[PDB]
Symmetry: D2
Subunit: 174 residues, 4 copies
Amino acid sequence: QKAVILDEQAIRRALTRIAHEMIERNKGMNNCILVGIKTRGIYLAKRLAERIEQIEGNPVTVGEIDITLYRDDLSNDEPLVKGADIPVDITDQKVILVDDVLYTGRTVRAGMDALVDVGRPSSIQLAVLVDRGHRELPIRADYIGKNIPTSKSEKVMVQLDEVDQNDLVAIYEN
Amino acid sequence: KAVILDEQAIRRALTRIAHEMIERNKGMNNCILVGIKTRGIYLAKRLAERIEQIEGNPVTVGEIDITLYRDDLTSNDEPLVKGADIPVDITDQKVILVDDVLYTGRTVRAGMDALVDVGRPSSIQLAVLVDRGHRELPIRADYIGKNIPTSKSEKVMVQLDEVDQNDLVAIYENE
Amino acid sequence: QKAVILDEQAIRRALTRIAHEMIERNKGMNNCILVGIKTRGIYLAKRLAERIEQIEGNPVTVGEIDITLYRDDLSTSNDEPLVKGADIPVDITDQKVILVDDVLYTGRTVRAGMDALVDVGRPSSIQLAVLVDRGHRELPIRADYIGKNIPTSKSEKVMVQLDEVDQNDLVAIYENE
Amino acid sequence: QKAVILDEQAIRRALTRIAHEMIERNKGMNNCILVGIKTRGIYLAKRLAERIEQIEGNPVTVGEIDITLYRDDLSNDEPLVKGADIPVDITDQKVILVDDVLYTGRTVRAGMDALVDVGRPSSIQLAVLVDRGHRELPIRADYIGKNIPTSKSEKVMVQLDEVDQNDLVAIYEN
Ligand SMILES: Nc1nc2c(ncn2[C@@H]2O[C@H](COP(=O)(O)O)[C@@H](O)[C@H]2O)c(=O)[nH]1
Ligand SMILES: Nc1nc2c(ncn2[C@@H]2O[C@H](COP(=O)(O)O)[C@@H](O)[C@H]2O)c(=O)[nH]1
Ligand SMILES: Nc1nc2c(ncn2[C@@H]2O[C@H](COP(=O)(O)O)[C@@H](O)[C@H]2O)c(=O)[nH]1
Ligand SMILES: Nc1nc2c(ncn2[C@@H]2O[C@H](COP(=O)(O)O)[C@@H](O)[C@H]2O)c(=O)[nH]1
Ligand SMILES: Nc1nc2c(ncn2[C@@H]2O[C@H](COP(=O)(O)O)[C@@H](O)[C@H]2O)c(=O)[nH]1
Ligand SMILES: Nc1nc2c(ncn2[C@@H]2O[C@H](COP(=O)(O)O)[C@@H](O)[C@H]2O)c(=O)[nH]1
């Protein structure tokens, strides 16, 4: 069992709204790059970029960051960057990280630290489809599809058509 | 004096708000916009046109007019409804009130009451271009163009093309 | 079957924090009156008043509002809270009034309370403190002071127990039925 | 000058309220340490620690992080950690960073990086007296004395008695 929170239509409308928020807050998307985290983040980033191209008429560059969980186990797991593929110079550019779910914030901090270390973007923003709460760092998403309250024993399933052959956000037990 | 939104920023805020309204109401079926006073009504019409463009269905726009009444002896004026024109039945429908500036919240409270003498809507939401803070009632906007905390000794000037021949939001010293 | 969200200590901490937020935002609680809604709101208001008296050294006046649900459109359609009585022992004109309730949900109860106060007096402002905000607002109303956000799903509600009313202090979420 | 925002009394009330928030959210402040950034942050952390102990009778440890702005030209400056004095093991502990003003977020990110790398706290929170907006990273304060959006062309003056012989927060055109 699992409670469906967003269906395909609700995902589409949240992403469309997010695109218009990005255009609003960046005053056009000139000099902005989207960088998706991991598989689902990258597909979200591509969906946003296509939407923005359609709205403004200019392409938006999309990069990728890969992040993987390392364990003791010996426990605090640690996400570490395994690779980045960003096809343009980010220095003095606005970078928007994109991910499916925000939870502790540790994945984004790794992504942020990587970008800040390797380039000097003028700013880094964050867009997520879901914020599930329970942050363990002072990190917040600038753009949020849906706030989904959860308990620690719950997990959010994000399905995307490209990866999963369904567009759906649902909450489930472990 | 600061300019806070220029014409382009106003347009992008209203476009975003339209998409927010479609999102949260899951399509703007069974949802009506009601504008407060002159500028709110024009903002409501702008939002309605945008929504029609996005979803392909018209959205009904109503109007509420609200006048300030005053007593003798900074404060104590009371906004009262002086007319409403809502062209459809609002009972069991979602209504979104629309205004330019949220300040004390007293004007919205007068509008919220009025709505309830014309239908029992299933819910009432509020969209404003600017929230300037200093609420005197527990009222909040659900959709906000720009959140702009101000001092009591400041004022927000909202100009709209339909009324003022220019689109702008700026803050100036009340003094 | 319920999850305890706040125990007696966490309720005390939230209310203590709320008292300090009130003092901060009102820059002292001079010319402020607390008005509790229904039974549990009133007891919360009294607790908050006692705390504020302790912090600032001056008593805070507490009033009461009673509010009851009426039905039926007779077609079922949404119930309407109406004010049944109010006991406010001082003049509120030009005073700050803080409404106090246990749980904020649609906002309709507070709108009735607010409409009443604004009608019969002309306070300089009205604020709202609640122990719990459960979400699902149907009106543009928010609490100024909030003990705990406890979002509820469709089948859930929030149980609030207070020592004065329930012989125990606890906030828990439960499945209705 | 352009505006006062907090006088002494307001600073005292905001810090008292913050202390109560910290007791509430951390359920007492057991296994929680405050770390002040730079001179003014450290004085704020000390005021908060003293208040917290008075409320429930439990002492709070205060550490210090020093952070200096490095420049590449004589507006992309970089705050770097110059020193830290953390007097207890922070592994599996909650840490609260404390500063006077949050602006771009880059100072906090440097401080965070300094903690997260050199201890493994269970979480890191942030308390500030003023949030002045214009963030350039997805960083937010958990505790805020006063939320004060500003233009890039104004500065926030924070005066604290320990240093400045006056308590005040004000905005200045600069
Ligand atoms: N689908 C899903 N991903 C999660 C969930 N919690 C964490 N994640 C994954 O882990 C990262 C977020 O976790 P955090 O690092 O913020 O704790 C994201 O890359 C996300 O894909 C969840 O509840 N559901
Ligand atoms: N244009 C402008 N209108 C204001 C301002 N403050 C209040 N108002 C107007 O008065 C109403 C809101 O004031 P409130 O009733 O919320 O105090 C709105 O209808 C708005 O048009 C302001 O600072 N600028
Ligand atoms: N950026 C900026 N904000 C101001 C100025 N004056 C007032 N404000 C904003 O409005 C609030 C004023 O609230 P007051 O305490 O004056 O009622 C401040 O907290 C701040 O957020 C100003 O000169 N510049
Ligand atoms: N104990 C409790 N009371 C509730 C709950 N939901 C609504 N209420 C009660 O109903 C009123 C608020 O409901 P509203 O009018 O905001 O929909 C309050 O007076 C409160 O006592 C809940 O989940 N638990
Ligand atoms: N007093 C003051 N300090 C500031 C201001 N802007 C940044 N800072 C200092 O710089 C840090 C925050 O800047 P950030 O790194 O967030 O851009 C804090 O350590 C703070 O003391 C300001 O406007 N006034
Ligand atoms: N109240 C007030 N806020 C200001 C003033 N100047 C700037 N701000 C705040 O700072 C924000 C950003 O300023 P901007 O970066 O757009 O110049 C404005 O949206 C506004 O909230 C001012 O003179 N008074």
